[PDB]
Amino acid sequence: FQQGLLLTPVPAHARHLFFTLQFPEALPAALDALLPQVDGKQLLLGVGAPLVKALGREIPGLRPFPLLDAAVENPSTQHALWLWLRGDDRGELLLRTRALEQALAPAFSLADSVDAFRHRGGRDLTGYEDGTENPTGEEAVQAAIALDGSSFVAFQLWKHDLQYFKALPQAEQDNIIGRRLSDNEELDDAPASAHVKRTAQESFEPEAFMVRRSMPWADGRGAGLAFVAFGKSFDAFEVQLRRMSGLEDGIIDGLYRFSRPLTGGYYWCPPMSETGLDLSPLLR
Amino acid sequence: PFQQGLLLTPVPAHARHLFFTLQFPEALPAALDALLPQVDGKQLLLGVGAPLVKALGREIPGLRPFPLLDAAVENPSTQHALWLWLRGDDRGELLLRTRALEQALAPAFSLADSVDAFRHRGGRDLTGYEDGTENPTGEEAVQAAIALDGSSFVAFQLWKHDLQYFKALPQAEQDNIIGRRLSDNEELDDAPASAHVKRTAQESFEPEAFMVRRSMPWADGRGAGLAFVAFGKSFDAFEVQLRRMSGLEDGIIDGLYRFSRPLTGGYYWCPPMSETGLDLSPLLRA
Amino acid sequence: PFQQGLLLTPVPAHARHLFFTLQFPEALPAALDALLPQVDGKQLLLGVGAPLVKALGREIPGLRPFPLLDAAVENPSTQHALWLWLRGDDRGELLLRTRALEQALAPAFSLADSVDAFRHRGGRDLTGYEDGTENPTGEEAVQAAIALDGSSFVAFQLWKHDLQYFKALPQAEQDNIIGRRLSDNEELDDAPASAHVKRTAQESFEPEAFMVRRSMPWADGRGAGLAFVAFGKSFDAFEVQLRRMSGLEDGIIDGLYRFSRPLTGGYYWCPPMSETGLDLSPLLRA
Amino acid sequence: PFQQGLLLTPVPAHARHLFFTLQFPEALPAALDALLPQVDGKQLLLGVGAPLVKALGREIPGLRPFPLLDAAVENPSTQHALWLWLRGDDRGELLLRTRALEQALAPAFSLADSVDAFRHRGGRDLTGYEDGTENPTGEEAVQAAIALDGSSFVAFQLWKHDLQYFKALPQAEQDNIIGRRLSDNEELDDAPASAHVKRTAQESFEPEAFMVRRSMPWADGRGAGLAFVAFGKSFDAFEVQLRRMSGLEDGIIDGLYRFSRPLTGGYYWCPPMSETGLDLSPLLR
Ligand code: HEM
Ligand code: HEM
Ligand code: HEM
Ligand code: HEM
Ligand SMILES: [Cl-]
Ligand SMILES: [Cl-]
Ligand SMILES: [Cl-]
Ligand SMILES: [Cl-]
């Protein structure tokens, strides 16, 4: 009843599209072209707070990406629509992008774009395995899917300073992540600022589990990780980010030593029906 | 006791805005020792962002990050730690001063964003419209922009224009978006409420929302538009204006959003000037 | 005794082309010490450009810079000193290898150009047409691409496609530009003389102009198109083909120039392989 | 009867170079109808490249594509069909004029390259050295730049500087690369033969290689450097200079290549002016 956000491993190639609603009067023609194409597998769709506000509607649990008043930067760059394309090669995704652009215009204007790819079967560009402690199976459904079959996804485009980080001694890299790069073993003696120490899913009250589908990226803006986290609500992601940002106990996550998010967005993933994507709470 | 430059009558012919992230806080003293003697408030202005204050465990009354507006239009919040405003003679001089500031601020600060700005004609937006007609001048500008202690609070947005769409509209449709006539800059009393000058009428707020604007056009690989800059004695004037423009006051959205949208957003505290340079004392005391 | 990976069909799913300028030739020995142990001719291929040979005061028979064609279409000559062809499993591996090669090759070499390439739909151009159908295979490929001493001479062009224009044409007009039918790749004998496969028919030259092509699609901020690569036992095959495509043989210009244009052009000598690595002796002897 | 603006010294504070590819030559008439009335030779100069002439099956004496130098340094040849030189008061005016020229010139022409250029400190390179000290002036400039029929032949290269490397050199080493003293622009008679002014000494050639340079610094995403422009009554002066700079005359390479390298290269024919606009008659019967 949900989309294909739980399919593991992440595809070898993906592309993230973010649109601004520039001409709301042309919205019906855009939806008529877009909605029949959203199968939740090769094409996923997320709805942003501006689109809901433009329709004068309300989605329980939906809100723009938050504003954290911290010593580290987490920008809020909320858009109206997020499209997640998954495919076989980057050329297919490029041609599919052009078709979606022309089909969504003039109602929607493309505001941002990111090509993403799987690295070495699921590693960050720093080399560390990504997704080790993700919930799987039925635990993944309970962490990511709400009762009505919808999901709430958070997105950040993290930009890595690879030259600084990879020039550190391997023990210093391991103390930033909280795991050993050589064999992915957890470092129990890592400082409290270590990433996996900051984001330990069982260390929150209530527990802050989420389903992450992050993928590395690289273009003219640099290189890093396209962070994606699916949850039954934004509660899990938001308390994690606030602890990572030092807003819980004053200790800042080690990731901010070498990486920084360039964007931030919240999106509501609608459920699927027997006849396509179920946007009924928005179109009545 | 302010920094001046921000009140200097016309905008300089060329300027450059630099935005830095506080990447290594342990190296901050050396960066400040190199930077502060160069801040004269005329050729080089400085603004302090909320992350820098938070990293020092201090607090500046009136300072906060760029707000989050839950509206039908997009106003992103992209707050950085430090804002440097270079004003100069040519773009090459500003480029060379930029490189020198980068080496002096490193490794404590990492350059996060940059925009070259230039004066167009006598002070016009790239659409052709005059910019600054109803700005406060003289003592009214000081009262609107400068707080009692001599500091100022500046808001910044990098607006990106869709010039092809806007300039292809009939001139009457362009005029109804701005609220003034491009042919002679006359105000249109019969413009719809969504017109920009109707949305931002400084006397139509309670209390009055006057501010001192120093916007300048820009153009690079990201496109072209207006680098919007608004100085105030507090952020109240700018923020109540932006919320009305975004339709959060009465449901009417400003006409600017038909062809333009901001890519960035930042709040910065402009410290006052003392007899011996920039006064950063509320951040460097005990 | 050649660089085996130039005959590998199909091309790997991901590759990256690097082009370096010899910026400080006095620092060449340290760069070669780091580079040569990595050149296996499979995951990393190497080509030597005429500027590098001239900087050493030597000569390579068959090597010369990319030619200058005085035609009505543009084939720019952007010859560099070194060409590296990286092939790998995913784009991230090639990115990390690029950074390592950049730091190891410095300061002697400066990276002048870079292109990420990928296989599309099993070996198709971004326009949809199959690429490589009439490539020589087996022993014929060796005879067309490999010189007697085991070296090869490779020509490179970065072609930029106007996909919106081309794909908006009626399918019959697209087919007459390529010379083959998109529906089933069958050759059109009744295509106009300007059709690509009519221009480049390898048996229609005297002597025959066979070559081994390893082109791969590309896409970045500059646009999208085909990273054209042609291996030959000499540059004779490629050059007579390009001159006919450019209308310098019979006044008829190839149809590809209706929607695509090369942004770069380079000639590079691929040295032979020995039992213990790349054989650069004709360049570092005596 | 030339395009006045090419002798205007100093160059205006802001300019923009546009280079177009002839993508659809059948659509050329509508493009020329829109373009030619705008070419005054002052705010808008025009140069014709060899591909445009070849596409019309014509020939211009003295015109040819940018040469191919087989040297140890890189001078790329990136010849285009059309060169437009916009000059104005601010970068925004040039930006709006560029968009208008793009829409008017399409679909025949496609914009292939663009460079914003600006005057630095009254006429200095970004390295600080004065640029234009030994340019011909007055009637000597006319004799060096203008052919008999009033046309000119202009060479263009987009030079990219490595300012970090160059400005980190000792001041004596910087001076030996240029051949002049940065403090007061005095000529260094004891500078090495590789020094720029020693390589390019206009009187040290037979015949003499004088030309009128109108170079201006530039800066965008590709870096920063000098947009080199040289006007001559023919291409002989520029080409014999460049071959010496590249070490093809005596094996000595110009010191500029230690910190700078050209990214583009083009030759263009600047048609003469008549009393009623640009004279393209040798190209349109
Ligand atoms: C540059 C950005 C990031 C990088 C490179 C990164 C990388 C990693 C790595 C290598 C692990 C350990 C392997 C694993 O369990 O998957 C991990 C764990 C985790 N990360 Fe991140 N991550 C990033 C951002 C984030 C953010 C922003 C959040 C939440 C707001 C987050 C939440 C988590 C969680 C929940 C875990 C699992 C913790 C556990 O072991 O229970 N990650 N991350
Ligand atoms: C693309 C962005 C913008 C453009 C092109 C633009 C342009 C203009 C123009 C042409 C005028 C009329 C001439 C003048 O009074 O100076 C004006 C007035 C004004 N604008 Fe904007 N502006 C932009 C953004 C903003 C924003 C974001 C704000 C506030 C949050 C703002 C506040 C004002 C105010 C206060 C006035 C004077 C209104 C009055 O007459 O009292 N502007 N603007
Ligand atoms: C935008 C640039 C180009 C594209 C999209 C392209 C595409 C194609 C396609 C679709 C074919 C037919 C299938 C095949 O046999 O491979 C082909 C054939 C061929 N191409 Fe190209 N090509 C390009 C540039 C070039 C250039 C510059 C040359 C030579 C200088 C060249 C040489 C050949 C040859 C020799 C053949 C085989 C001809 C034969 O049937 O005997 N190609 N190309
Ligand atoms: C990065 C590229 C270049 C830079 C920064 C540069 C800069 C300079 C400077 C500082 C001078 C001395 C002051 C003056 O008399 O103008 C000069 C002189 C000169 N340059 Fe260049 N130049 C460049 C490229 C070229 C090229 C490519 C040519 C010719 C092909 C050239 C030809 C000349 C000539 C003829 C002179 C005058 C020599 C004399 O007779 O004294 N320049 N240039
Ligand atoms: Cl989704
Ligand atoms: Cl940056
Ligand atoms: Cl400028
Ligand atoms: Cl000086």
Closest Cα partner for C114 from C218, C35, C36?
Answer: C218
CA–CA separation, A173 vs A170, rounded Å? 5
Asked if residues D78 and C76 have their Cβ atoms less than 8 Å apart, the reply is: yes
CB contact under 8 A, B120 and D163: no
Beta bridge partner(s), residue A259? A160
CA–CA separation, C92 vs C2, rounded Å? 28
CB contact under 8 A, D76 and C79: yes
CA–CA separation, C116 vs C18, rounded Å? 9
- Measure CA D221 to chain center: 20
What's at B103, amino acid-wise? Q
Strands (E), B194-263: 212-213, 216-220, 223-232, 260-262
- Measure CA B280 to chain center: 21
CB contact under 8 A, B72 and A63: no
Closest Cα partner for B49 from B13, B91, B20, B85?
Answer: B20
CB contact under 8 A, B91 and D219: yes
Please tell me which chains touch A, using 3 or more CB pairs under 8 Å as the contact test.
B, C
Is there a domain that residue D63 lies in?
yes
Helix (H) or strand (E) holding D155: strand D152-161
Name the closest residue on chain A to residue B67, using Cα atoms: A67
* DSSP character at residue B133: T
* Bridging pattern class, strands B14-22 and C44-48: unpaired
DSSP one-letter string for D222-258: TEEEEEEEEEESSSHHHHHHHHHHBTTTTSPBPGGGG
Asked if residues B216 and B132 have their Cβ atoms less than 8 Å apart, the reply is: no
Number of domains within chain B: 1
Per CB distance under 8 Å, which residues of D are interface residues toward B?
13, 89-93, 95-96, 99, 118-121, 126, 163-164, 217, 219-221, 224
- Measure CA B184 to chain center: 27
* Bridging pattern class, strands D14-22 and D109-118: antiparallel
Three-state secondary-structure class, residue D211: coil
Closest Cα partner for A19 from A110, A134, A88?
Answer: A110
Ligand 3 contact, C201 CB (< 6 A)? yes
Ligand 3 contact, C226 CB (< 6 A)? yes
The sign of the dihedral angle between the CA atoms of A136, A138, A139, A141 is positive
CB contact under 8 A, B70 and A54: no
The token pair at A183 is 């064999």
Asked if residues D17 and D117 have their Cβ atoms less than 8 Å apart, the reply is: yes
Q: Is A77 annotated as a binding residue?
A: no
Is there a domain that residue A283 lies in?
no
Q: Which residue in the set B65, B66, B72 is minimally distant from A54, CB to CB? A: B72
Asked if residues A61 and A268 have their Cβ atoms less than 8 Å apart, the reply is: yes
Torsion of CA B70, B75, B79, B84, to 10 degrees: -150
Ligand 3 contact, C200 CB (< 6 A)? yes
Q: Which ligand is nearest to the CA of B258?
A: 2
Using a 10 angstrom Cβ sphere, with 0-12 exposed, 13-18 middle and 19 or more buried, the burial of residue A95 is buried
Asked if residues D259 and D165 have their Cβ atoms less than 8 Å apart, the reply is: yes
Residues sharing a CB contact under 8 Å with residue C224, sequence separation 6 or more, in sequence order: A94, C126, C160, C161, C163, C217, C218
Ligand 1 atom, smallest distance to A241 CA: 30
The token pair at B9 is 């009558």
CA–CA separation, C260 vs C9, rounded Å? 25
Q: Which ligand is nearest to the CA of D127?
A: 4
* Distance from residue B116's CA to the centre of ligand 7 (Å): 7
Helix (H) or strand (E) holding D112: strand D109-118
CA–CA separation, A176 vs A161, rounded Å? 14
* Bridging pattern class, strands D14-22 and C277-278: unpaired
Task: Return the best residue to mutate from C180, C200, C240 for the ligand 3 pocket (most ligand atoms within 8 A of CB).
Answer: C200
Please list, residue by residue across D58-89, b when 16 or more beta carbons sit within 10 angstroms of its beta carbon and e when fewer do.
eebeebbbbbbbebbbbbbbbbbbbbbbbbbe
Q: Which chain C residues are Cβ-neighbours of D54 within 8 angstroms?
A: 70-72
Ligand 4 contact, D87 CB (< 6 A)? no
Is there a domain that residue D284 lies in?
no
CA–CA separation, A168 vs A171, rounded Å? 8
What's at B223, amino acid-wise? G
| Residue count (chain C) | 286
Ligand 2 contact, B134 CB (< 6 A)? yes
Name the closest residue on chain D to residue C256, using Cα atoms: D23
The token pair at B5 is 């430059």
Residues sharing a CB contact under 8 Å with residue B232, sequence separation 6 or more, in sequence order: B144, B145, B152, B153, B154, B155, B211, B212, B238
Beta bridge partner(s), residue D117? D15, D218
Which residues lie at CB < 5 A from ion ligand 5?
Answer: A 44, 46, 269
How far D161 CA sits from the closest chain B CA (Å)?
13
Q: Which ligand is nearest to the CA of B214?
A: 2
Ligand 3 atom, smallest distance to C125 CA: 5
Size of interface A-C (CB pairs under 8 A): 49
| Residue count (chain A) | 284
Asked if residues A176 and A258 have their Cβ atoms less than 8 Å apart, the reply is: yes
Report H helices in D130-218.
138-145, 163-167, 171-178, 196-199
Ligand 2 atom, smallest distance to B241 CA: 30
CB contact under 8 A, B96 and D220: no
Three-state secondary-structure class, residue D22: strand
Gyration radius (Cα) of chain A, Å = 19
Other residues' Cβ atoms within 10 Å of the Cβ of residue B170: 8
Asked if residues A216 and A124 have their Cβ atoms less than 8 Å apart, the reply is: yes
User: What Å distances lie between residue C132 and A120, C146, C208, D277, CA to CA?
Assistant: 29, 18, 18, 51
DSSP one-letter string for A158-180: EEE-HHHHHTS-HHHHHHHHSB-
Q: Is D208 annotated as a binding residue?
A: no
Beta bridge partner(s), residue C125? none
User: What Å distances lie between residue A44 and A31, A47, A85, D25, CA to CA?
Assistant: 14, 10, 7, 44
- Domain residues for the domain of C95 are 4-284
Cis status of the peptide bond prior to A60, with omega within 30 of 0: no
Closest Cα partner for A90 from C197, B35, C126, D105?
Answer: C126
CATH number of the domain encompassing residue D272: 3.30.70.3420
* DSSP character at residue B231: E
CB contact under 8 A, A88 and C121: yes
Beta bridge partner(s), residue D229? D156
Is there a domain that residue D283 lies in?
no
Ligand 1 contact, A227 CB (< 6 A)? yes
Strands (E), C98-236: 109-118, 152-161, 212-213, 216-220, 223-232
Size of interface A-B (CB pairs under 8 A): 67
φ, ψ of residue C147 to 5 degrees: the values are -75, 175
Q: Which residue in the set B51, B77, B78 is minimally distant from A72, CB to CB? A: B51
Name the closest residue on chain B to residue D97, using Cα atoms: B126
Beta bridge partner(s), residue C36? none
Ligand 3 atom, smallest distance to C201 CA: 41
Asked if residues D60 and D283 have their Cβ atoms less than 8 Å apart, the reply is: yes
CA–CA separation, B246 vs B254, rounded Å? 6
Using a 10 angstrom Cβ sphere, with 0-12 exposed, 13-18 middle and 19 or more buried, the burial of residue A225 is buried
| Residue count (chain D) | 285
Is there a domain that residue A235 lies in?
yes
Q: Which ligand is nearest to the CA of A211?
A: 1
Q: Which residue in the set A24, A72, A77 is minimally distant from B78, CB to CB? A: A77
Ligand 1 contact, A129 CB (< 6 A)? yes
The token pair at A235 is 């509660």
Other residues' Cβ atoms within 10 Å of the Cβ of residue C221: 8
Asked if residues A1 and A271 have their Cβ atoms less than 8 Å apart, the reply is: yes
Helix (H) or strand (E) holding D94: helix D91-105
Strands (E), chain B: 14-22, 44-48, 82-88, 109-118, 152-161, 212-213, 216-220, 223-232, 260-262, 266-270, 273-274, 277-278
Q: Helices H, strands E: what count in chain D?
A: 8, 12
Is there a domain that residue B170 lies in?
no
Asked if residues C53 and C64 have their Cβ atoms less than 8 Å apart, the reply is: no
CA–CA separation, D192 vs D184, rounded Å? 19
